[PDB]
Design a protein around this ligand. Structure first.
Ligand code: NA
Length: 121
């Protein structure tokens, strides 16, 4: 159907917007602390602590399979990266501080993306 294609063009455009957002968020992590999943070989107990791991590479795989239906789903995944880190790592750690900074800096980007998604539909 013709609707299904129109829908697929918007999902495709949403993916386009979300890719740009993902790149901007990832730039706020120059240390690359959140780039890849936490290693289960190096942190073997991690899943005892954190039930839903997340990282920027895993978000990118979902993004490119058009696995994000709306900005809400995408923000959920971004929030997981931050919130998981802030639970597993103590307050006085380079990792916890890096999450706080990603959260603060990412807020500005997410703020405008929500407006863009509402504006362009
Ligand atoms: Na903690």
């Amino acid at each position: 159907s013709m609707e299904q294609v129109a829908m697929e063009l918007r999902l495709t455009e949403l993916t386009r917007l979300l890719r740009s957002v993902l790149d901007q968020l990832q730039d706020k992590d120059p240390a690359r602390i959140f780039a890849q999943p936490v290693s289960l070989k190096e942190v073997p107990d991690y899943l005892d602590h954190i039930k839903h791991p997340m990282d920027f590479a895993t978000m990118r795989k979902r993004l490119e399979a058009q696995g994000y239906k709306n900005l809400h789903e995408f923000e959920e995944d971004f929030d997981l990266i931050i919130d998981n880190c802030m639970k597993y790592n103590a307050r006085d750690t380079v990792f916890y501080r890096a999450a706080v900074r990603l959260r603060d800096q990412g807020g500005v980007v997410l703020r405008q993306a929500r407006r863009e998604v509402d504006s362009i539909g």
